[PDB]
Write a protein that binds this ligand. Structure first.
Ligand SMILES: *[C@@H]1O[C@H](CO[C@@H]2O[C@@H](C)[C@@H](O)[C@@H](O)[C@@H]2O)[C@@H](O[C@@H]2O[C@H](CO)[C@@H](O)[C@H](O)[C@H]2NC(C)=O)[C@H](O)[C@H]1NC(C)=O
Ligand SMILES: *[C@@H]1O[C@H](CO)[C@@H](O[C@@H]2O[C@H](CO)[C@@H](O)[C@H](O)[C@H]2NC(C)=O)[C@H](O)[C@H]1NC(C)=O
Ligand SMILES: *[C@@H]1O[C@H](CO)[C@@H](O[C@@H]2O[C@H](CO)[C@@H](O)[C@H](O)[C@H]2NC(C)=O)[C@H](O)[C@H]1NC(C)=O
Ligand SMILES: *[C@@H]1O[C@H](CO)[C@@H](O)[C@H](O)[C@H]1NC(C)=O
Ligand code: NA
Ligand SMILES: [Zn+2]
Ligand SMILES: [Zn+2]
Length: 388
């Protein structure tokens, strides 16, 4: 059997390599497989999309419906890092790939990967590392060290699967924007890390025994501040926050709302036409194609805004130049799928696919029985060599 290394670079847009010199990614395209682009799950958030990659399920089905743990009764809203340690958020009836693999005699590890630092139905990941609260995500010397550690897990601790997470270029994209020179310098750093990764695989004699997947969770688009028709809840005339019991706003282009008892119809009629670029739905009427709304955790009202626009609640508190979370049909939200290894063909480009199919692939690559999921293995199977 071959080992598996899945690497994710947060917020790597499908065409980030097109206006940057990416020698190592280009080589990996020659030596392996590439998707024209990969369509992420909706919502296009970090944690929900990452969990889809390791469960093969749409977001409504695995239950991680937001970067933030929230609780409508207690009114708690925990940011991304804190939520990485809330077990009940991730252990909601779906089983990520580490746990499935370990029940079938494999050893699996998570390095900074969302959902990998908690237990599922009482089981823990064989090896797990979680970053600090104020972690620095762009330190290249730290990147190379983490790869060294992951390599030791493969060789010294007889691990078969590792999921390794990097917080760039999402961080740099957010701060300076996806079209900035800073982003491109960060993509250049990523590309150097791809080469270090492949060189580290060869140095450890795993080139012919280890399959490598390099992907991401979503893309990134610019937020124009020059635009004037901002989505501001505090400027909706016939709407009042007096009708809201719980709210989740001021977080990119996705919002949720739980009105006080009996005021749901009042709030809805106020907001359904409030802004031509804010699409508000009753939970039942939210588009099925998104595969997002039908989860008990989602609130009776949810909404999303058009590309380039974020949702402002009581007061504007968002200043990022780039954002994600938008419609997964938007090209700017599309992301990458790259892979190389003994089981993978070479020089192959495939038409786009949804990220929900990565799970079935990884399970076939590990020779394990997949949990029931929303993907289909026939989608990505052309990527693999025919056996003899
Ligand atoms: C960038 O990161 C390197 C590496 O950080 C160290 O290794 C990590 C994997 C982790 O174990 C951290 O706790 C470590 O800090 C930093 O290099 C280290 O810097 C400190 C000085 O503050 C020193 O004690 C160590 O010897 C250094 N290690 C090496 C290999 O050089 C570096 O400081 C970081 N730089 C920035 C600007 O964040
Ligand atoms: C998944 O999480 C949801 C929400 O955190 C759980 O839903 C709650 O479940 C208990 C029943 O045990 C109720 O007391 C709450 O009122 C439920 N709230 C909602 C909004 O559904 C759900 O039980 C969890 N499921 C699993 C399998 O862990
Ligand atoms: C979450 O990650 C932490 C590391 O950030 C894991 O803790 C380490 O576990 C090993 C062995 O149990 C120890 O030698 C380290 O000293 C631990 N460090 C810290 C800071 O705890 C932890 O096991 C992970 N948790 C889960 C549930 O996987
Ligand atoms: C939210 O917190 C409440 C309030 O303490 C708690 O009783 C319950 O476990 C949680 N409820 C839901 C629906 O998550
Ligand atoms: Na390039
Ligand atoms: Zn992300
Ligand atoms: Zn982000």
């Amino acid at each position: 059997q071959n080992k598996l290394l899945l690497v994710s670079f947060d917020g790597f847009r499908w065409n980030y390599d097109q206006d940057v010199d990416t020698p190592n990614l280009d080589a990996m395209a020659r030596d392996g497989v590439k998707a024209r682009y990969m369509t992420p799950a909706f919502v296009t958030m970090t944690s929900p999309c990452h969990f889809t990659l390791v469960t093969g399920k749409y977001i409504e089905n695995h239950g991680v419906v937001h970067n933030m743990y929230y609780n409508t009764t207690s009114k708690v809203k925990l940011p991304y890092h804190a939520t990485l340690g809330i077990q009940r958020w991730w252990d909601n009836g779906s089983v990520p790939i580490w746990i499935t693999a370990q029940r079938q005699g494999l050893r699996a590890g998570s390095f900074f990967y969302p959902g990998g630092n908690v237990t599922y139905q009482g089981v823990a990941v064989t090896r797990s590392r979680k970053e600090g609260i104020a972690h620095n995500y762009k330190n290249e010397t730290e990147w190379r060290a983490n790869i060294d550690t992951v390599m030791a897990w493969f060789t010294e601790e007889d691990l078969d699967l590792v999921t390794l997470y990097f917080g760039e270029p999402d961080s740099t994209g957010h701060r300076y924007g996806p079209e900035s020179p800073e982003r491109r310098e960060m993509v250049r750093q990523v590309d150097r890390t791809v080469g270090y990764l492949r060189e580290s695989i060869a140095r450890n004699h795993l080139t012919d025994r280890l399959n490598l997947i390099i992907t991401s969770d979503h893309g990134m688009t610019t937020v124009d501040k020059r635009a004037g028709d901002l989505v501001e809840f505090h400027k909706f005339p016939n709407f009042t926050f007096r009708d809201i019991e719980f709210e989740l706003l001021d977080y990119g282009p996705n919002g949720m709302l739980l009105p006080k008892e009996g005021r749901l119809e009042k709030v809805y009629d106020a907001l359904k036409d409030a802004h031509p670029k804010l699409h508000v739905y009753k939970k039942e009427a939210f588009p099925e194609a998104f595969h997002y709304a039908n989860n008990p955790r989602v609130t009776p009202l949810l909404m999303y805004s058009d590309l380039g626009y974020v949702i402002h609640g009581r007061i504007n508190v968002q200043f990022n130049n780039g954002e994600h979370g938008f419609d997964n049909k938007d090209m700017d939200m599309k992301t990458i799928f790259r892979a190389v290894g003994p089981s993978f063909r070479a020089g192959l480009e495939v038409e786009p696919f949804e990220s929900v199919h990565v799970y079935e692939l990884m399970c076939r690559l590990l020779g394990i029985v997949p949990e029931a999921n929303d993907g289909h293995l026939a989608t990505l199977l052309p990527m693999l060599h025919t056996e003899s």
